[PDB]
Symmetry: C4
């Protein structure tokens, strides 16, 4: 008799792939937490007078402040095993910035020939940048204090070190305790030479299996990903067979007929792309879990795109029924005029973006970059953050009243014009009908 | 002659039930205030260097900080009757965590065999968790200071105690002063082993009538709830009679005819459910006021659902008139296509939710959990918090620019696609008409 | 020939009345500023450890804190002429709270018989409240320190005083320097008996002309308001004449015909109400400027309502032209179905409001009162503060997960149901057409 | 044969002009950063106890606070070369406020005859304002301490000085290091005489080429702007030719025919305006880069308006195709009824604005000025900041409950009325069709 459709295999995919994603997601979350919490601690350990939330406004304004910040950072590094809870370890760095047997590297980076002399208006500068590094060795368990800074020639000051730690959060997830090495860089940046030196701390973790994990009680994830590979490979073969058979029938139709370029359903192309991205992502995740490679951005993006493109196959299966099909056809027929209107709205929107960036960039905090301007305008179209924009512009009414008037006209015209255009677009879409 | 409709009884319900809710609500509000204010005080009494608003970011970062926090908490417990205003009382706890004659319990909870040793990469851990408790007795009106912590093996530190107090706010509401016992637990949590130990304080109140309330001037609430019971029981009987009579007429129609499954109006089912929930909620509230049981979540939920389902009966009574009936029929006929569109929009929305959680979870504060992702997307559809999302993603443009580009594409595509789909859904709903 | 319409008189009104409002508004703004700035200063002068923005969370938590706050307030009152800039004056209060020759009144207010005794669960309280007041005299240019508080019986502590000052901001507005007396009340409120005593400062100003204003260079406002009176009185007479003539014609039509109840245009009723409110408001403003009465709430409300109802007469004059008339008629014919739908939407909205208040009141900050619940739901319908609501509910997912699930269902159902109902209402309004 | 259209020249414009804008924008951004960062530093250098974000609430409340603030500012000016990083230079000011050989000017500004005397209610004031200035000379590398203030007569206190610096950020942009002079004014403002003296710091930069820039490695921008001039001049000539030829044909049509007033396409007028504004802006930018004039507001506004009006020419070129033309014609035919409705909505909106400003101005932070009221109402129409408005009004429910009730009615009526009017406007726009 009539055999049933093997499309149930895809119903497996929507389940199986999704489960994989969830599992991966959970694990990934834990890791990022362990990376973020540590970073917070490092700030509180190494940044003098640091408080939560003061990340972008944290800076030094006097020479004494800079000296105390640097000395506090180095002293807290030297006194880490006594004052810090968390069981960090020194690395005795043998890389490029550190010599063979040094833990911390305080490097002051400044111009070679710099004679800045206001009150006469003369100056000669050689943009070539020299770097002077003082190496400090971890406590056993000295000369960093005698450090001049040359504030007139200063470009930046950087502190580099590393700390090895053991991730004990795995036991909650029944994993074998993971194993980290954090590279910490503290930068006092004087690029602007404006009298304000921002201070920041950044970290980079290098996850690696450590030597002897003698954990008690110490085969499901590894089998799950190969199951994903098998199912996705099966779909690839089946969809490729459909693509070939359809193309053969189209090839005969070419001579027969001798919209014609569209004889293949894009659903199979979507499924093929989903399988390709799921297989690439799952191989990358196999490598990530094995610790042989560390790139969690590409793998997550691939898996998420695969999951989304797989959840559009449910719409594919919904099309079958007439009731859903009518609405889907209405969507499909509405699309082209929407794109056509979007072209003209886009050129007006680009013009407004350029004007807003060039005029309100100096004064408005929300117009600093072109991407920020586009985001602000897009959110303003949908009715978000309108009053905060108006109030941010009102805060500078005392200075450059002409700029304030132009901003008022610009914002009012943009909002009114774009709401009007959407409504007109549709009364056309209710007439054509 | 034609007797008038007894439906006025339901008009009583909408009044009477509502009044009950309001009364209950008012009383409940007072109690929660007395519970929240006390908690705030406890924080300010027991958390060292605590300030309002620093609840999620409150943590300790050095061993000395942890020691001072613990010792300050215990000392403030010991000096409570002298420094604290509010007239709290010790309990001399005789429960499980406290021995017979001890008030406070400082319990340090740590692994049994733990040898964490970075700089060699080896480690052996036994996940079995030992607990060492030091009992402190309330002041009459000692050895807690000699406490090591074992920071390498630490899991958490907990402080348990109780405080009895008298609720004097009742006099405002002309009640007999209520009577509380607060169980306070202060946890320093080192589960992450990340060098940052969050500190928090939680409370649990046990309301109970106390022994001899010799209040001056010391029968309406008790009579009101039984009135609710009578009225709701009456409605149950009347609606059940209607259900039976309709079903008998339907039973004859079955043979006669031998939409057919729908011969009963859902209004009576709604009213029956309302009566059932109001009776259950009012019995539970009787018990709550009598102090025999303490569960204010189920009772409030039941009463609120009953009130809402009772206020839909006003729509029932509005249907009668033709003018309202036409609009109600329009709503009813519009519903099915809305559900049908909601299915496809839902599968696209689930796909987008999974993709956003898996990709932007590590970096974006609004994508930490699947429920949070769904809430963010739902609020983004309606035009809320769009620019804060864009700015939170812009804050991490320097690192992983590929992630930033993907986030831009993802957000723009989601917003544009979903606004487009609503409009297309309706131009279908203006054609079908 | 055909005389032109005297309706130009109303065109005068829209101008003249508006101008009056603007003038009044400007003056009023100055006064409120002088009242608010002073208040801020008083806080910074009299509240110990007070900082801007800490108004609702400012409280005392220990007996020593309360004692220091009270003593600091009294000492700062005693040392005002030496430490405070602003030239305030003592009043030597001769009112009720102050005796003849006392400036400040520190009044502790506590029960008469109060024996609160936890750890035995007994208590006797006499709700009668005694008050003990200590009077302090202004410095010439003593025994307040010996003050017990009786924290177990305490209800509140209040500090009352007054300060006379001269408003010098008038010179900017070319007025004669106005002249204030601020009554300051500082309350430490212990009504909750929860261990947290909120501290707040409130003021009340009594503007009065002072004795001898020998200002240099020292007739337009007074003439302007009588011009408003004349014009508004003229409109009243003219509109009343129209009302009478129309009613006479209607009276004959009654017998002739023997919508019939509507033979008078509501525009004249609107204008009559506008004139009545403008005359009342301008008389009240005459009195306010003369300083004979001090109530700036009624007068401002009357003037604003008059201005709005006068700016609707411009729509009246727009109706004349056919193009505007067609749109206005469309609005008028659309109104009744909107009201009819609003009834049913309102009963569903009231039901949801009651349910949300009763369930999420204890846990959610936005559901504390019924008015707050209604405001939150109304703003949620229009797409505002959705994600902050969801996040505030997410913050309490750990405790009472059933409440969190109910909140999720409640919010999602409310938003989806109400957006659906608006769209259905209109597809009816596009069919009927 | 048929020559191709020279309209490709305009396709050049859209490119070339845009590029210019971007280049200008980038440069401008750098300058404003160098101006803002320095200002921040100056605050942190000269304002005693200043912290980021405390700009509007920063004020002094006691005489000692004012004295310490003034003395700290002057001392930090005197100790700038030793404590400040950034290499600023003294100017030895020879302007009006400074004498020949003085760097800083501390000027106290107060009335001539002022006898403010509360507790008797008398006062005589002479509005003539005397000014007493103390000149301080920069450190070599004294009597400012003996300064009385006359707080009863005080109007304000001002500190004026200048600082020369070298902009070293150019090297990043491969420019020749720019060269600044900042005029700093610190004002302690006592205009209100309310006991609260706001303290603020403002700066004004004067960019000028300095004397001898002996930079190493030291013709594209200058050539680019003249290219813009050539292209825009070409368009002016071509569009003027089209305008003349069209007008000649219209002139003959006048006699022939003897909408008739519209025989010229507004696209050429738009292009002519774009060319005029681009040429003016590019000449102004030439002058700005040459440092001969310093006005970055007019030039940026001109360039942005030119860019926007040039990006509307892409819509001009889109009109050609029929598919886009149909939608554009729908927009054009929809416009007039939108304007006609906007008139009536505007008069209702003006009425509501006046009422809201006059009533809620004293109490609501969002209704301080008419422009602020209009912005708040416009954002409220689109569904933004609704709940913050409601909560700000709820915060003052205890005082003037009548005002709170009026605010509730006003806000609800405004929102409901205006949403209703948009929908009615369109059901008219779906009928007319
Ligand atoms: C992506 O659009 C943009 C993206 C980035 C910046 C500006 C825009 N624009 C151009 C388009 N307009 C949008 C207005 C609000 C939403 C509708 C329009 N999106 S869409 O392109 O037509 C569309 C339709 C269907 C599916 C996918 C996309 C106006 C702003
Ligand atoms: C509940 O919906 C959701 C719930 C949770 C997450 C996602 C969705 N979805 C799916 C549905 N879509 C909604 C878009 C905005 C509002 C209209 C749609 N709600 S509804 O289900 O059709 C509906 C209609 C009538 C009565 C009750 C419900 C799109 C997001
Ligand atoms: C005032 O309405 C309310 C007021 C307070 C609480 C709840 C509501 N409701 C009931 C009405 N609904 C409103 C939904 C959004 C706006 C349209 C509806 N306003 S309106 O009454 O019909 C109307 C129409 C024309 C003129 C004046 C009023 C739904 C919430
Ligand atoms: C600019 O409008 C205003 C400006 C400032 C204050 C108030 C308004 N108003 C009057 C107009 N209404 C607006 C409501 C929301 C948006 C539509 C209406 N803008 S528009 O003028 O008709 C229009 C249409 C097409 C192109 C350019 C403008 C209502 C508030």
């Amino acid at each position: 008799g009539r055999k049933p459709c093997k499309l149930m295999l895809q119903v497996v995919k929507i389940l199986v792939v999704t489960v994989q994603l969830i599992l991966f997601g959970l694990s990934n979350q834990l890791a990022v937490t362990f990376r973020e919490e540590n970073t917070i601690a490092f700030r509180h350990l190494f940044l003098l007078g640091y408080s939560d939330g003061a990340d972008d406004t944290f800076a030094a304004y006097t020479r004494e402040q800079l000296y105390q910040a640097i000395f506090h950072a180095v002293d807290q590094y030297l006194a880490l095993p006594d004052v810090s809870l968390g069981r960090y370890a020194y690395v005795r760095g043998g890389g490029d910035p550190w010599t063979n047997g040094s833990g911390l590297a305080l490097c002051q980076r400044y111009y070679h020939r710099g004679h800045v002399d206001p009150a006469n208006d003369t100056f000669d500068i050689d943009p070539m940048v020299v770097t002077d590094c003082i190496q400090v060795d971890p406590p056993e368990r000295s000369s960093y204090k005698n450090l001049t800074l040359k504030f007139h020639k200063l470009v930046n000051v950087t502190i580099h070190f590393r700390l090895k730690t053991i991730n004990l959060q795995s036991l909650i997830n029944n994993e074998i305790p993971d194993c980290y090495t954090f590279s910490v860089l503290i930068t006092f940046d004087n690029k602007a030479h404006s009298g304000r030196i921002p201070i920041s701390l950044e970290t980079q973790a290098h996850i690696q299996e450590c030597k002897h994990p003698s954990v008690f009680q110490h085969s499901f994830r590894l089998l799950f990903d190969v199951v994903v590979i098998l199912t996705c490979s099966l779909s690839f073969l089946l969809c490729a067979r459909s693509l070939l058979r359809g193309f053969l029938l189209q090839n005969e139709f070419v001579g027969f007929m001798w919209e014609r370029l569209e004889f293949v359903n894009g659903w199979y192309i979507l499924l093929v792309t989903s399988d390709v991205l799921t297989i690439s992502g799952t191989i990358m995740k196999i490598g990530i879990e094995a610790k042989n490679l560390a790139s969690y951005d590409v793998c997550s993006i691939l898996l998420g795109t695969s999951t989304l493109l797989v959840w559009v196959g449910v719409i594919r299966y919904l099309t079958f029924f007439h009731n859903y099909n009518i609405l889907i056809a209405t969507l499909r027929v509405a699309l082209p005029s929407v794109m056509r209107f979007c072209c003209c709205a886009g050129v007006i929107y680009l013009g407004y973006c350029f004007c807003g960036w060039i005029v309100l960039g100096p004064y408005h905090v929300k117009f600093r970059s072109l991407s920020m301007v586009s985001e602000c305008l897009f959110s303003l179209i949908n009715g978000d953050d309108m009053f905060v924009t108006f109030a941010a512009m009102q805060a500078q009414q005392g200075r450059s009243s002409l700029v304030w008037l132009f901003s008022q006209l610009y914002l009012y015209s943009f909002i009114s014009l774009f709401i009007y255009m959407v409504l007109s677009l549709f009364i056309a879409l209710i007439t054509g009908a």
